[PDB]
A paper describes a structure:
Biochemical assays, site-directed mutagenesis, and X-ray structures of mutants of human Polλ incorporating sequence determinants from P. tetraurelia PolX or metazoan Polβ are used to investigate the origin of their fidelity. To further probe this mechanism, we engineered and purified five mutants of human DNA polymerase λ, the closest relative of Ptet-PolX, targeting residues that contribute to the induced-fit mechanism of Polβ or that are suspected to contribute to a similar mechanism of Ptet-PolXs. These constructs also included the following mutations to facilitate crystallization and diffraction: Δ1–241, KGET, and C543A. Because we could not crystallize P. tetraurelia PolX itself with various DNA substrates, we set out to crystallize mutants of human Polλ incorporating sequence determinants from P. tetraurelia PolX or metazoan Polβ: these structures indicate that a Loop3-based fidelity mechanism is incompatible with the fidelity determinants of Polβ, which is based on a large conformational change (open-to-close transition).
Numbering used by the authors: 251 to 464, 470 to 575
The structure:
Amino acid sequence: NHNLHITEKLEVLAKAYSVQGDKWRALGYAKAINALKSFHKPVTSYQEACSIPGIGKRMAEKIIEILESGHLRKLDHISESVPVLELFSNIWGAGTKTAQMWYQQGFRSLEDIRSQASLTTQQAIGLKHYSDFLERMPREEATEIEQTVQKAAQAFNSGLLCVACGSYRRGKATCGDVDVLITHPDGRSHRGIFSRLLDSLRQEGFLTDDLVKGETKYLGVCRLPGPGRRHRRLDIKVVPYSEFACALLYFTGSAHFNRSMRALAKTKGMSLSDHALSTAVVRNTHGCKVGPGRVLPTPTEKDVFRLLGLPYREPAERDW
DNA sequence: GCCG
DNA sequence: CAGTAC
DNA sequence: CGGCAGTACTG
Ligand SMILES: Cc1cn([C@H]2C[C@H](O)[C@@H](COP(=O)(O)O)O2)c(=O)[nH]c1=O
Ligand SMILES: [Ca+2]
Ligand SMILES: [K+]
Ligand SMILES: [K+]
Ligand code: NA
Ligand code: NA
């Protein structure tokens, strides 16, 4: 909380490495930023920095250069392309490779992209909602969106469970988007639901754009009725009842939380996914899986933590 | 970038 | 497959 | 040295 003197400047570098494609270096920065964001005291000494898991020599040296100087020299040598690459990769469906290609082609503005760029179907939808998708909504709107999906789903089968996950479920005041997880306790009635449900939501004009339409994941765009409404990203994921706890866990996040849980499971010979916690997973020397293992029974999220030797954590306690 |  | 996002 | 989470979709 109190190290913003440092994190604020480190975040500029992390983002700069991210948009330029240097994904693992940006992962290092992102981790050290989360570490700093959860210490107890403001870091004041080189040796006090290296004590924190995720902060090494190079990162500690920058941490001191900020206290001795208030500024970090690296920030003055960030490529002039970075603001433009960030602009381009804030389009949904465009990442670092697409942004770098557009930059190499001489594009510098969203007007350039609009008029001259080659765009996928997803990216054109991303661009059309560029401003709207950079906004977080108040959680009260997220409730309305979840309620709209629930009511349409439960109209086909009142046995369907519907749970909004993500930052909503972690109790945040604003939500970048809404993910509604859908299952059925009977273990089979969840099947074949999309075609009807999405049609129901489509007929009223609530769904405005589809980005992904898979057998289990729908990603798209919605807008509530009336004036004053913005387009929002909506996900609907339909899973079998036995995978519900692992799905709830993944889709609730946070992303850094999921990755640290999965990294932990790997060290214990296990494998954790949005489908299941698996055991006796056989892997090779590069950490790649070769043998699948056995699915462990996880009727609730508490079981996942227990099977991993961890104290449970409420959704609100999973920011990192 | 960090860490085993 | 590579790219992207969940 | 070398992995850093695991998977679903798209074209
Ligand atoms: C962005 C992101 C999300 N997630 C998970 C955690 C998020 O709560 C969940 C839904 O993503 P979203 O909130 O961006 O729709 O997906 C990852 O596992 N990895 C990622 O890189
Ligand atoms: Ca979220
Ligand atoms: K450390
Ligand atoms: K265009
Ligand atoms: Na993007
Ligand atoms: Na979403």
